[PDB]
Enzyme design. Structure first.
Site, PDB file in Angstrom:
ATOM      1  N   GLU A 272       0.789  -1.226   0.000  1.00  0.00           N
ATOM      2  CA  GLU A 272       0.000   0.000   0.000  1.00  0.00           C
ATOM      3  C   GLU A 272       0.833   1.294   0.000  1.00  0.00           C
ATOM      4  O   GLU A 272       0.333   2.322   0.470  1.00  0.00           O
ATOM      5  CB  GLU A 272      -0.949  -0.001   1.200  1.00  0.00           C
ATOM      6  CG  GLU A 272      -0.255   0.119   2.563  1.00  0.00           C
ATOM      7  CD  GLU A 272       0.039  -1.221   3.217  1.00  0.00           C
ATOM      8  OE1 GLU A 272       0.136  -2.231   2.496  1.00  0.00           O
ATOM      9  OE2 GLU A 272       0.188  -1.271   4.471  1.00  0.00           O
ATOM     10  N   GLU A 306      -5.783  -2.286  -0.840  1.00  0.00           N
ATOM     11  CA  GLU A 306      -4.703  -1.307  -0.864  1.00  0.00           C
ATOM     12  C   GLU A 306      -5.222   0.106  -0.647  1.00  0.00           C
ATOM     13  O   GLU A 306      -4.581   0.911   0.040  1.00  0.00           O
ATOM     14  CB  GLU A 306      -3.944  -1.404  -2.185  1.00  0.00           C
ATOM     15  CG  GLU A 306      -3.376  -2.778  -2.432  1.00  0.00           C
ATOM     16  CD  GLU A 306      -2.536  -3.251  -1.269  1.00  0.00           C
ATOM     17  OE1 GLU A 306      -1.635  -2.505  -0.859  1.00  0.00           O
ATOM     18  OE2 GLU A 306      -2.823  -4.332  -0.734  1.00  0.00           O
TER      19      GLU A 306
END
Ligand SMILES: *[C@@H]1O[C@H](CO)[C@@H](O[C@@H]2O[C@H](CO)[C@@H](O[C@@H]3O[C@H](CO)[C@@H](O)[C@H](O)[C@@H]3O)[C@H](O)[C@H]2NC(C)=O)[C@H](O)[C@H]1NC(C)=O
Ligand SMILES: C#CC[C@H](CP(=O)(O)[C@@H]([NH3+])CCc1ccccc1)C(=O)N[C@@H](Cc1ccccc1)C([NH3+])=O
Ligand SMILES: *[C@@H]1O[C@H](CO)[C@@H](O[C@@H]2O[C@H](CO)[C@@H](O)[C@H](O)[C@H]2NC(C)=O)[C@H](O)[C@H]1NC(C)=O
Ligand SMILES: *[C@@H]1O[C@H](CO)[C@@H](O)[C@H](O)[C@H]1NC(C)=O
Ligand SMILES: *[C@@H]1O[C@H](CO)[C@@H](O)[C@H](O)[C@H]1NC(C)=O
Ligand code: NA
Ligand code: NA
Ligand code: NA
Ligand SMILES: [Zn+2]
EC number: 3.4.11.-
Length: 855
Positions: A272, A306
């Site tokens: 992420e 994410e």
């Protein structure tokens, strides 16, 4: 000379404020140079600055304070992954200093740090890119830093590169300056305050596509040029999902852009990094002709995961890895919250309870751990990325949300995110935010500070419904939970609620009922046993009018019945008798649940001298689902749930030699081969078709010959699965060797290939042997404590069920000493094998007799 700091955690009294990072990478020599400048302050007068550095060659360090400057002596402690910078004068408290470090390194050949990734063009040319993966503790392999997530700072990144390369990072490119012949320096804008593990940069020849959100954020997908035409779905999904989170939390995404980059070599599914999220190609790229329904679902859910992290993880970060679940449980949970709104046709909420049953598999073991639990070294930190942090974390959040109500839950989460923006949180901060809207803290401490889950036992006497809780463990603890129980009855399909806070309690129904069913929709992180005629009553319900309870309530009864076998509360015969209702089941979740309970039984038998009962059990399973199998069409028609059900049923039928499916599969494979692999098969039948075709030498060789040229992640996955199903041991040995080597099959596929061959009825000895012989290189590639290593350990060993296999496992891993003997996955697989031994010893002959009667 002696290293002046002897703790793994950094000192708390030197704090970074801001990093200037200059990185000059050479993609030909596979080396890089860096200059790191970090503004710091000291709370205590100190003369030593300690920070993280791993496999970096430090050439020079200096301390800047009328712009004075002085040299720092450099000591190293490689085991602690630290360096010490010794100053001539003690630093003055409260005054800003700048530490300047010059260093060199080699691009990593693993999947972490600043690492090399490669791909081949359509004519076979090898291309190289360099990418980063820092979470949890690998930023220190790319630049020296205070590499713990609570030392947040802003980052100004500059990348020196050749004109032929593109560089991207967390923030937009604000300036490019030619600094020498054939050398350009890219300047990226300064980041917001964030943790070191979120820094990212990529030097490649990627192409991109872009779209702007209604809030003005530029979203782009990057991929290798040959695959950028597969980026459209993810781009649209990312815009819709980013818009969802911004509107849902009413906290805007703070950066001007969000990139999604498909990396040719990548260890996890995605990562992420703030402004530059990264993905396996299989988790991001969609081919409208070749991708499967499950791959489309996987892209949607991975992007949702994410983007959830931009709030749960990036904006608000756990203070230390003991509370990783605050990042990962929330991001896992948010996949379902978000996609149930943005992609209602996927109906993902129906699938959520399955994560909870996955978590319960490990959480029923003594070797599980509490959701929040202490860790110190990098291997232990990597072990936190497991089914407890992700699946149990999401499941107890779902349970809490149902208990508090969605609106109260949401209000607490919004207040939590606002209060702790650009800061770090602990378990207690979350409970305090929820409570600011009932004793959430006491309740949720029972679910986060002790391992495991309760068995709820239900005893009915007329209208009196007695309840008991006890820790469920496969063969003292005294654990108690605050359990938010739910139930429905034959007289009321309203969800009724009872908070069980003690070992025993009771409730009084208004009128007697014909049955009662606890844990409605399987939203609670617990299992249920019914005393007296309870299981007979619920079995009669499923066999007479199964739609009286929901599909997920049926799945929960299937799962719980077999869990109760393992602790002697229900006989295997009664649990198998209940599974017979599946002959009239139509819905994917209870069908898949039946498969998830019955398949593991013959997987145990396959590794034993048990051919007769193994064969009869598999025949029972096909006969049980035969009508549903026969109803499947060999098309890609229907909903995502109908497509995934079709594909799995046809694969199952063909693997077990159900002749109608085998004949159809062979005919499709022969036509596909005759077309020279140019025939368009229904994607949903391709697993079965390829798995059947791979059983012959000529079919295997042909399948492999087409693998080279595929640009489709689904097609590559389908071919890999099929090739691992051969009974030719020489071919299985080749797959392990070549994916380990990484040239013909990428090493990112090796954990899955090893596991697939470990599940092969003739390959499992080869997989276990390969793991033992190549352990050291596999650990070097993937790292002790990684989920990759855990799944290779479990995937090669956790279906063994003899004392001799158990001793092989104990003997091998104990011999590794500091290179693996203390892995949690090793204790888990040992405990699993021990359970398997007891379970098979008790139930094998019972199953044999039951199958004979089932005639
Ligand atoms: C990574 O390292 C490689 C190898 O050392 C570097 O390639 C080399 O780059 C230099 C500078 O561009 C080349 O020399 C120059 O050649 C041009 C003509 O092409 C000439 O006009 C200049 O006066 C100078 O002589 C050199 O030939 C080249 N070597 C190879 C084998 O390609 C590369 O620049 C490095 N990249 C980075 C980002 O550091
Ligand atoms: C959905 C999604 C994305 C999630 C990774 P993430 O966004 O959470 C990232 N934060 C992990 C950092 C990281 C990377 C490597 C080692 C340690 C930590 C993911 O890939 N999930 C896997 C299972 C898994 C989880 C963690 C690690 C490997 C595999 C899945 N198939 O479900
Ligand atoms: C990067 O790799 C190079 C090797 O290519 C390493 O350089 C070697 O370092 C050792 C120890 O000083 C020397 O004995 C060798 O002679 C060096 N090899 C060459 C070719 O110069 C270098 O140390 C590595 N860098 C890091 C940070 O690990
Ligand atoms: C779990 O393991 C620990 C340490 O090995 C042991 O002391 C404890 O008794 C075990 N608990 C159970 C319930 O087996
Ligand atoms: C078959 O080949 C043609 C021509 O090369 C190509 O355009 C088409 O996409 C191919 N179809 C499949 C399913 O491979
Ligand atoms: Na990764
Ligand atoms: Na991993
Ligand atoms: Na482990
Ligand atoms: Zn995550």
């Amino acid at each position: 000379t002696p290293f002046p700091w002897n703790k793994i955690r950094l000192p708390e009294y030197v704090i970074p404020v801001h990093y200037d990072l200059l990185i000059h990478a050479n993609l030909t020599t596979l080396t890089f140079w860096g200059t790191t400048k970090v503004e710091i302050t000291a709370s205590q007068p100190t003369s030593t600055i300690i920070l993280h550095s791993h496999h970096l060659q430090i050439s020079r360090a200096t301390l800047r304070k009328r712009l004075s400057e002085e040299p720092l002596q450099v000591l190293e402690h490689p085991r602690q992954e630290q360096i010490a910078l010794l100053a001539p004068e003690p630093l003055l408290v409260g005054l800003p200093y700048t530490v300047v470090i010059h260093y060199a390194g080699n691009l990593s050949e693993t999947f972490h740090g600043f690492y090399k990734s490669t791909y081949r063009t359509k004519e076979g040319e090898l291309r190289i890119l360099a990418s980063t993966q820092f979470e949890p503790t690998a930023a220190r392999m790319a630049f020296p830093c205070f590499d713990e997530p609570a030392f947040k700072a802003s980052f100004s990144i500059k990348i020196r590169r050749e004109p032929r390369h593109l560089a991207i990072s967390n923030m937009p490119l604000v300036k490019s300056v030619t600094v020498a012949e054939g050398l350009i320096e890219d300047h990226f804008d300064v980041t917001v305050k964030m943790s070191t593990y979120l820094v990212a940069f990529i030097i490649s020849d990627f192409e991109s596509v872009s779209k702007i959100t209604k809030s003005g954020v530029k979203v782009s997908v990057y991929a290798v040029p040959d695959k950028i035409n597969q980026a459209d779905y993810a781009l649209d999904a990312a815009v819709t999902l980013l818009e969802f989170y911004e509107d849902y939390f009413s906290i805007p995404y703070p950066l001007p852009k969000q990139d999604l980059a498909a990396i040719p070599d990548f260890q996890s599914g995605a990562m992420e990094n703030w402004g530059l999220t990264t993905y396996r190609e299989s988790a991001l790229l969609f081919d409208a002709e070749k991708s499967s329904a499950s791959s489309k679902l996987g892209i949607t859910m991975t992007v949702a995961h994410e983007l959830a992290h931009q709030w749960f993880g990036n904006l608000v970060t756990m203070e230390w890895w003991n509370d990783l679940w605050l990042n990962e449980g929330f991001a896992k949970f948010m996949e379902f919250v978000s996609v149930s709104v943005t992609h209602p046709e996927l109906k993902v909420g129906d699938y959520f309870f399955g994560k909870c049953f996955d978590a319960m598999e490990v959480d029923a073991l003594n070797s599980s751990h509490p959701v929040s639990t202490p860790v110190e070294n990098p291997a232990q930190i990597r072990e936190m990325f497991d089914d407890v942090s992700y699946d149990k974390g999401a499941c107890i959040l779902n349970m809490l949300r149902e208990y508090l109500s969605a609106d109260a839950f949401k209000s607490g989460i919004v207040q939590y995110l606002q209060k702790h923006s650009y800061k770090n949180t602990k378990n207690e901060d979350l409970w305090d935010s929820m409570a600011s809207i009932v004793d959430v803290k006491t309740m949720m401490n029972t679910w986060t500070l002790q391992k495991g889950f309760p068995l709820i036992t239900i005893t009915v006497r007329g209208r009196n419904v007695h309840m008991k809780q006890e820790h469920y463990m496969k063969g003292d603890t005294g654990y108690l939970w605050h359990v938010p129980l739910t139930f429905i009855t034959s007289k009321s399909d309203m969800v009724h609620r009872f908070l069980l806070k003690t070992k025993t309690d009771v409730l009084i129904l208004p009128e007697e009922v014909e049955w009662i069913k606890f844990n409605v929709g399987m939203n609670g992180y617990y299992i249920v046993h019914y005393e007296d005629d309870g299981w007979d009553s619920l079995t009669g319900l499923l066999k007479g009018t199964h739609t009286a309870v929901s599909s997920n309530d049926r799945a929960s009864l299937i799962n719980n019945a077999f869990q109760l076998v393992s602790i002697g509360k229900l006989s295997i015969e009664k649990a198998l008798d209940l599974s017979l209702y599946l002959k009239h089941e139509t819905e994917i979740m209870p069908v898949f649940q039946g498969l998830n309970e019955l398949i593991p039984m013959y997987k145990l038998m396959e590794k034993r001298d048990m051919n007769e009962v193994e064969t009869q059990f598999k025949a029972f399973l096909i006969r049980l689902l035969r009508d549903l199998i026969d109803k499947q069409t060999w098309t890609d028609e229907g909903s995502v749930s109908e497509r995934m059900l079709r594909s799995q049923l046809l694969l199952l039928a063909c693997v077990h030699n159900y002749q109608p499916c085998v004949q159809r599969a062979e005919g499709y494979f022969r036509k596909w081969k005759e077309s020279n692999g140019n025939l368009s098969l229904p994607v949903d039948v391709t697993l079965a078709v390829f798995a059947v075709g791979a059983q012959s030498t000529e079919g295997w060789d042909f399948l492999y010959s087409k693998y080279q040229f595929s640009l489709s992640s689904t097609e590559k996955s389908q071919i890999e699965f099929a090739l691992c199903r051969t009974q030719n041991k020489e071919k299985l040995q080749w797959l392990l060797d070549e994916s380990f080597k990484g040239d013909k099959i990428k090493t990112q596929e090796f954990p899955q290939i090893l596991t697939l061959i470990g599940r092969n009825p003739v390959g499992y000895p080869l997989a276990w042997q390969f793991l033992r012989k190549n352990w050291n290189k596999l650990v070097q590639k993937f790292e002790l404590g990684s989920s990759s290593i855990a799944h290779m350990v479990m995937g090669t060993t956790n279906q063994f069920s003899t004392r001799t296999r158990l001793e092989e496992v104990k003997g091998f891993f104990s011999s590794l000493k500091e290179n693996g003997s203390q892995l949690r996955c090793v204790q888990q697989t040992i405990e699993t094998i021990e359970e398997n031994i007891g379970w098979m010893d008790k139930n094998f002959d019972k199953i044999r007799v039951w199958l004979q009667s089932e005639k």
